[PDB]
């Protein structure tokens, strides 16, 4: 023994990967009602009949939703029962003893998906496993109804029978560290680039323009993103729990909407800023005093703090469904749950209103470039590439999330929890992209050369 590295070999982890933990009732690949980790509730298609078995098996009014503690106990029970059925059964016991440790898990994994009676119907494939003809049983087992309905999970178990090793599953562990180091590169990039932007404007007179005053507010929201928002969410995803208590859960949730709102509303302020600086250069400097710009900065942070802490810290954002009420009570749960009132209104204030203003002025900056005092020249394609990056980058990062942000409260279980977090993180990396977009000026290009080399 003496093995506490990561990924031990066991049926416990093997089944977590094939089943996945899911606290609310759901229809499996076939359509049967299931909960927890691959727990079959009932074959009756009525959801109320599924709750009745769950409420009896739990000893509580679950409302179709169980806690992460209850799911683990149903998972060990279904596992311990699959072994008891292998031992009570005539076809399975000889093959279970004849099997080695790793291939015993493959036999338990079938019995926990199909029952003792079902796994025992593989008379030929069990006869092949009996004589240790792994490659021949792997060919046989790939011809069955079981392979046909869940080819992914069957190919993994069949490979575990064939090779006798966990390579069908051990590749899962490489994706954990690869996700982690990628998160570390994201946190370093956002903090590196945005601390550099804020510093160049603070120490350097040539960079204290009105347009950089908005750049500074953008880099401030992006800096808090990489110092506060991103790091706790990386610890959330990797630990698969929340270790900082309930109060810090919502105030991490509060700082997140605070930054993403102020970040995008600043990008909207910049798009209008350059529209006046480009199309009306002379009034743009007469009207927009450094004080008037600072008031515009306070409007964004006041709209953002009202759209982020005020709802969340007042519990207005909260959902009412049972998995939401449980997560609000779990100290270790910090999953995001909202009502359709908040998921919609925040997307308008955070993303959609700024998006429309931005799609409007940037396009108008080019329509009114045409009606000037003058030939298919090269600097227009150069400028056309530049704004395509300014709007192609902002769109690909946040549009996929805020679309999904609206849909996940319109038709439930249409957007997997997994995808909602990935598109959310795909938005988080906008904060690292921004310094590489809005700070390409020769004045910045010099301040960055002197801040680093000299
Ligand atoms: C809860 C944290 C972890 N993610 C949020 C969830 C929705 C949301 C974001 C940003 C701005 C908004 O307006 C939002 O409604 C995302 O970052
Ligand atoms: Na909570």
Numbering used by the authors: 858 to 1231, 1263 to 1342
Show the paper's wording:
The amino acids that form the orthosteric binding pocket for epinephrine and norepinephrine in the β1 and β2 adrenergic receptors (β1AR and β2AR) are identical. For example, the nine adrenergic receptor subtypes have different roles in regulating central and sympathetic nervous system functions, but can all be activated by epinephrine (Epi) and norepinephrine (NorEpi), as they share a highly homologous orthosteric binding pocket. In an attempt to understand the structural basis for this subtype selectivity, we solved the crystal structures of the β2AR in complex with c-Epi and c-ISO at 3.2 and 3.4 Å resolution, respectively. The structures were obtained with a previously described nanobody Nb6B9 and a β2AR construct with T4 lysozyme fused to the N-terminus (T4L-β2AR). Nb6B9 binds to the intracellular surface of the β2AR, the G protein binding site, and stabilizes its active conformation.
We synthesized all the eight possible isomers of ISO. Of which, the (R,R) form (compound 8, c-ISO) showed the highest affinity for both the β1AR and the β2AR, but not the αARs, in radioligand competition binding assay. Interestingly, the (R,R)-isomer also showed selectivity towards the β2AR over β1AR. Our structures reveal that F19345.52 on β2AR needs to move up by ~0.8 Å in order to accommodate the two carbons that rigidifies c-Epi. Similar upward movement of F19345.52 is observed in the β2AR-c-ISO structure. Constrained ISO, however, displays greater than a 70-fold selectivity for β2AR afforded by a greater than a 100-fold decrease in the potency at β1AR for recruiting β-arrestin. Radioligand binding analysis suggests that this dramatic increase in β2AR selectivity was contributed by a tenfold decrease in affinity for β1AR, with a ~3-fold improvement in β2AR affinity. Interestingly, constraining isoproterenol had a major impact on β-arrestin recruitment through β1AR (100-fold decrease in potency compared to ISO) with little enhancing effect on β-arrestin recruitment by β2AR. Taken together, these data suggest that constraining isoproterenol appears as a β1AR-selective diminution, yielding a large effect on the relative effectiveness and hence biasing the signaling away from β-arrestin recruitment.
